[model samples]
Target: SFVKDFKPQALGDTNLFKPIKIGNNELLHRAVIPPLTRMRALHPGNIPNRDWAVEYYTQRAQRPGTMIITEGAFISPQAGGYDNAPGVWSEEQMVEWTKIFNAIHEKKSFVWVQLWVLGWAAFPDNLARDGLRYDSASDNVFMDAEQEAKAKKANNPQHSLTKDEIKQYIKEYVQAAKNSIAAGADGVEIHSANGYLLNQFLDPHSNTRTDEYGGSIENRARFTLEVVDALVEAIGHEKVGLRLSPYGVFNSMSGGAETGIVAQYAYVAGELEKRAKAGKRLAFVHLVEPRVTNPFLTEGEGEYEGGSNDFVYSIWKGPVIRAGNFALHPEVVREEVKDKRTLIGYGRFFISNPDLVDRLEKGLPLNKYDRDTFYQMSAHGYIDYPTYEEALKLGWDKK
Candidate 1:
């Protein structure tokens, strides 16, 4: 029913089920668990540690060959934008994260930590309380009026990062990447997408600076490239990856208001491809698709023309991972991997089906995810999702 116009390929024969090499590790299958922030447990100082996190990840990693990217972890106190989000900038956090990595490793699954730093999107009150000013590529735009009012009230107006601060953040990012590997992760994904710090600089309208960090396309991408270089230098390129959302307007991104979107990202892809050709190949470059299902939207409510993968594929010359919307239809995933250079990632479904890979393989029904409890700080909707077999016994499979 999902694909009437196209022939369906057997799951085992599809590229999605094929093992591929990522960096120094081998992914058993091409299905990836993209980073999903549950905003669960965190100790004081915003450090991450929880027996629950270990349990949660280990359960999902039980799927052979799956690569799991943990939720975004802040690189420093200044990067802590959400309550209960984990931090990777401290030894204490690394100690706990090591356990998380070990558990996933025991299952023979590859794991990575997504390093993040929220810039102007950080809640105004939070930044003001810490006496930290909101940083952006430019000071001219707020996501909307609410953000502008919040900035004015907090007296923490957003501004471009000084050259000195930019250098410091790069160092911090490298340190975070180092910490991720130290904590037993196989690699790290630089969180440059989603209107975060790196993206704030990538968008020309968001970034109105004349320094080397802004203006031209190359200038706008300077911060991300520097971070990539530093990370690859600290940890081999194979152990590094980057995630980008070229068409997404999430988190107040200008959606290519000033700079042409295709032009901006095409330059970045070409630059990274040049590195790959030179042999410092990164683990993978994850590209987000245009359509999103959650927080459902109607026409003109932040919608665009769509199609980001083609724009990236034309320029990036490395392994590609595509996510968003494709998870609901395996047939679409089959088509995506026909080129044999792509991988599939599932997000929301993983919340209710830790055995998602197995279910998809068996063509079993999947459990529905509960939206109300998604971001709660409890385990009710976290690790409680039953496997297919368990669901069968509980009569959860009755339609």
Candidate 2:
């Protein structure tokens, strides 16, 4: 939960609840469940646990046509360096996802599996244990001095991703996208936000190499665009979504208002829009607001100076899903959806309030989220949260 108390008023005439076309389906509403890593997937195999995930997502998918982006699932075994986060690489993992996707479809909701890969941001110990290398956009450059030391200490020293390695990553992503489609996903969102692998390349400070994949803005953005293009080629642009945080400062990212960050992302949006003009349009482009410094810290740090994502709308005129801090400000939802093709994403709130879509539509009080359980490996705060109707039956009153 954010330090600033959330006091939401009903969005009466906003475009949020209106039906909009994205990819191949016409959604019933614009309120979306953004990708949130629960860290509750099974270990060893790194597969989604069927019992809990099926029930957890099913609860959120209760509102028909809700667009739910599943947690960033690793694209390959070498791509993941965390415990319990699910992957799309294995048949076993896809089996669980197939179950989860079916459950969501049972409620008439659509889902997009987010393909993920952590570079230096990954846990050094996990990488070492699995005999995987701690890789990043550039060698020796880390998010912080401490992380570099940790990687060295774990005996998994950081290395720059070679051109060959980058190609492999792209292939892994393409394979994951196809696997997601085979498992019945509505789409596949490439995870290029949150200071992960793709985001690292986008940030100039992080990517210091002088190659076809780094240095200039185009080269910096090449990795992401290539991923998007490959996914588009493999599964059609209709089922591809790219999430970017243009002004995000998470995980030692240095992008901000005056930092030439705008131009870099503008080029990405322009390129994506460029594709649309060429008759290859993606499902949507998800952008995180600058207000969210990270998952826990909603509003702080250098955010007080200058930052806003308004520039993106100018270039990426296609469907854009704006997430990050909307959970704290419902007014942004009303304001953003005025563009018609815009959609608002609620991350943490959807965890506490399973019926977040209904609650916001009626301006009903919300269930305060449990921050401690946000990344836990249990269902204490995952599926136990009740619907507003159930809360009323239990004699709990929000009014």
Off by over 4 Å in 1: 1-10, 256-259, 293-306
Name the lDDT value of residue 310 in candidate 2. Answer: 84
The models' CA-based lDDT, in order, is 0.80, 0.87
Per-residue alpha-carbon lDDT of model 1 for 263-328, expressed as tens digits? 888898899999988888888998776665222343224435444458787778788888786545
Q: Give the local distance difference test score of model 2.
A: 0.87
Clashes in candidate 1: how many?
A: 2
Give per-residue lDDT, candidate 2, residue 93: 92
- For residues 225-270, could you state the per-residue lDDT of candidate 2 as single tens digits? 9999999999999999999988777787776743778889899999
TM-score of every model versus the real structure: 0.92, 0.96
Best by TM-score: 2
Q: Using alpha carbons, what is the TM-score of model 1?
A: 0.92
Residues forming the 10-long window of minimal summed lDDT in candidate 2: 296-305
